[PDB]
């Protein structure tokens, strides 16, 4: 019961809950999606992209550059053994 803001502002999340619910509901997995699953999915994406952005920013700062590029995002992934296992099968742009 707080009408001053959106779903992301109510949960204090920067990832939009409405877009994360659209991914979950329109994935063709199930007929019904609860309200709590939408907030939980947005928080899971938000925490670990904060992990990637923290490692990419430190990698970019160590390279004396103020703009995060593709190579800085790539170099941050294999520098963390736990992060690399999630997206090891992904194509990191050549």
């Amino acid at each position: 019961e707080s009408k001053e803001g959106s779903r992301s502002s109510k949960a204090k999340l920067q990832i939009s809950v409405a877009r994360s619910e659209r991914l979950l509901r329109e994935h063709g997995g199930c007929s019904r999606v609860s309200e709590g699953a939408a907030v939980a999915l947005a928080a899971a994406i938000e925490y670990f992209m904060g992990e990637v952005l923290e490692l990419a920013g430190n990698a970019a700062r160590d390279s004396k550059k103020v703009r995060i590029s593709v190579k800085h995002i790539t170099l941050a992934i294999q520098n963390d053994a736990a992060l690399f296992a999630v997206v090891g099968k992904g194509v990191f742009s050549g």
């Binding site: 590029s69 593709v70 997206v87 099968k89 992904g90 194509v91 990191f92 742009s93 050549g94």
Partner: protein
Amino acid sequence: LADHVSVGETQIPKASTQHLLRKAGSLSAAGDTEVPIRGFVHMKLHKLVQKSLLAMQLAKRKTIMKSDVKKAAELMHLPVFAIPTKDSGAKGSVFLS
């Protein structure tokens, strides 16, 4: 790989085959390495086009768009984070040569 190359078709140039080994960190390359390299690039493009063409046939189109390749990429259970938008080609992009 071994016999996926056929005489009569355009193939990857020999110096481009050696540059693939340099990006993998290989310090020395054999002279017979150009044959499995040319086969594997030819095999992966044959696999990618074949999946993408039947994605085009079902949608009743005649041009392979970026959505048909993307659906062909996820059909092999291979996630692709390189999605070329209209802003591609800017500076040091991953889609350039």
